[PDB]
């Protein structure tokens, strides 16, 4: 019926409604560190999030998205392997039922507790909807989360979750600064891939940061209290909303570092 992460509508079933699921440039993938090619021609990433304007947080039934005003060049990503300017539209996470799983990308088969995705679209395309139809339309920054010390800049997000517990709920979420979610280093791996949920379009340049951020056990615990279902429906906790690693096929992962 409609896709999700259960036994009956989970990732292994998505291909029946979205045949691109078995495509040549699907994400996530496992990052084999010894096979990744250092590419000295890759430039440092440029993250300008000082003018970021967050607007709202929404539970869409598969994750929670923090949305930003993308009507002007306020929070952009450029540099790295990118040509042009990519504007931040939303961020969301993927997490597990246990601390040993939850990320989508893996590093030498290692899974992290969660994975943050900062989604950006290429301004040459004018809007998000046009950007997803192009091979270079989106740039997604992926950041792994491991459990350890709390991340102070994540607390504002954690505290509003009670208010968007079920599908379709939203809350005003202004003045949130996404700079509090970045690791210290911006070293990364990059490869051409896709969105990791339907419609699985192959329009993403992935930029996965090598350095994870730490979150406390209590912070990740609050993610696991959300619900996949709508209000008044039987409770299904929002956990394990990650797609497993897909075949690399004819692709090379490049590293910005050695
Ligand atoms: O942002 S990736 O989940 O499609
Ligand atoms: Zn994602």
Q: How far apart are CA 236 and CA 233, in angstroms?
A: 9
Breaks (C-N over 2.5 A) in the chain follow: none
CA angle 248/250/253 to nearest 5° reads 60
Q: How many Å lie between the centroid of ligand 2 and the Cα of residue 35?
A: 24
- Rounded to whole angstroms, how far apart are CA atoms 197 and 94? 11
Q: Which ligand is nearest to the CA of 196?
A: 1
- Coil, strand or helix at 104: coil
CB of 143 within 6 A of ligand 1: the answer is: no
First to last CA, the chain: 46
Technique that determined the structure: X-ray
For 20, the 3-state DSSP assignment is helix
Closest CA to 193 of 206, 184, 211: 206
120 classed as catalytic = no
Contact 45, 186 (CB under 8 A): yes
d(CA 174, CA 225): 23
Question: Hey, which bits of 104-232 come out as E strands?
Answer: 106-107, 114-122, 138-147, 170-172, 188-193, 204-209, 213-215
Binding residues: 92, 94, 117, 196-197
Q: 46 CB contacts (<8 Å, ≥6 apart)?
A: 77, 78, 79, 80
Can you tell me the distance from the alpha carbon of 181 to that of 165, in angstroms, rounded to the nearest whole number? 22
- Closest atom of ligand 1 to 243 CA is 3
Three-state DSSP at 124 gives: helix
Spell out the alpha helix ranges (H) of 100-194: 128-131, 155-160
Q: Strand locations in 178-252, DSSP E?
A: 188-193, 204-209, 213-215
Tell me what percent of the chain is helix, strand and coil, each rounded to the nearest 5: 15, 30, 55
Spell out the residues 6+ positions from residue 159 whose beta carbon is closer than 8 angstroms to its own. none
Give the C-alpha separation, 235 to 142, whole Å.
Answer: 29
* Interatomic CA distance for residues 20 and 15, integer angstroms: 7
* Residue 241 near residue 176 (C-beta atoms within 8 A): no
Torsion of CA 28, 68, 131, 45, to 10 degrees: -60
Q: Whose CA is nearest to atom 4 of ligand 1?
A: 195
66: β partners: 57, 91
Write down the catalytic residue from 8, 15, 62, 120. Answer: 62
Question: Does the beta carbon of 141 sit less than 6 angstroms from any atom of ligand 1?
Answer: no
User: What is the maximum alpha-carbon separation in the chain?
Assistant: 55
Pocket lining: 195 vs ligand 1, CB cutoff 6 Å: yes
CA distances from 35 to 26, 82, 110, 185 (A): 19, 22, 15, 21
Closest of 208, 212, 68, 215 to residue 153, by C-alpha: 215
DSSP string, 81-99: T--S-EEEEEEEEEE-SST
Rg (CA), the chain: 17
Considering only CA atoms, which residue is closest to atom 3 of ligand 1?
A: 196
Dihedral sign from CA coordinates of 28, 31, 32, 38: positive
Ligand nearest to the CA of 193: 1
8-state DSSP, 34: T
The fold adopted by the segment(s) 1-258 is Carbonic Anhydrase II (3.10.200)
Contact 228, 237 (CB under 8 A): yes
Query: 140 in ligand 1 pocket by Cβ < 6 Å?
Result: yes
CA distance 71 to 194: 24
Q: Which residues pair with 119 in a beta bridge?
A: 90, 140
Give me the half-sphere count of Cα atoms (radius 13 Å) on the Cβ side of residue 41.
Answer: 4
Among candidate residues 34, 77, 19, the one with its CA nearest the CA of residue 204: 77
Measured in Å, residue 201 CA sits from the centre of ligand 1 at 10
CA distance 164 to 60: 9
State the resolution, in angstroms: 1.7
Cβ of 243 less than 6 Å from ligand 1? no
- Report the C-alpha gap between 102 and 243 in whole angstroms: 9
Q: Which of 117, 202, 241 to mutate to test the pocket of ligand 1 (most atoms within 8 A of CB)?
A: 117
> Torsions phi, psi of 180, nearest 5?
-75, 0
- Strands 138-147, 213-215: parallel, antiparallel or unpaired by DSSP? parallel
Residue 125 DSSP SS3: helix
Q: How far apart are CA 210 and CA 256, in angstroms?
A: 10
Please name the residue ranges forming H helices in the chain: 128-131, 155-160, 217-223
Q: How far out from the chain centre does Cα 243 lie?
A: 11
DSSP category for residue 42: P
């Amino acid at each position: 019926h409609h896709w999700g992460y259960g036994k009956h509508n989970g990732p292994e079933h998505w291909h029946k409604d979205f045949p691109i699921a078995k495509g040549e440039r699907q994400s996530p993938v496992d990052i084999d560190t010894h096979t990744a090619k250092y590419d000295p021609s890759l430039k440092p990433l440029s993250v300008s999030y000082d003018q970021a304007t967050s607007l709202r947080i929404l539970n869409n039934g598969h994750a929670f998205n923090v949305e930003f005003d993308d009507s002007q060049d306020k929070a952009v990503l450029k540099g790295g392997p990118l040509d042009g300017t990519y504007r931040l539209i939303q961020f969301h996470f993927h997490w597990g039922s246990l601390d040993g799983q939850g990320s989508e990308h893996t590093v030498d088969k290692k899974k992290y507790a969660a994975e943050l995705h900062l989604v950006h679209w290429n301004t040459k395309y004018g809007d998000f909807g046009k950007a997803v139809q192009q091979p270079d339309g989106l740039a997604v920054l992926g950041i792994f989360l491991k459990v350890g010390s709390a991340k102070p800049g994540l607390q504002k997000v954690v505290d509003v979750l009670d208010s968007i517990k079920t599908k379709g709920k939203s809350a005003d979420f202004t003045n949130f600064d996404p700079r509090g979610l970045l690791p210290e280093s911006l070293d990364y791996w990059t490869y051409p891939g896709s969105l990791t949920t339907p419609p699985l379009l192959e329009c993403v340049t992935w930029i996965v940061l090598k350095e994870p951020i730490s979150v406390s056990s209590e912070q990740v615990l609050k993610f696991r209290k959300l619900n996949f279902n709508g209000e008044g429906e039987p409770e299904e906790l929002m956990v394990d909303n990650w797609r497993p690693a897909q075949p690399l096929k004819n692709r090379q992962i490049k590293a910005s570092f050695k």
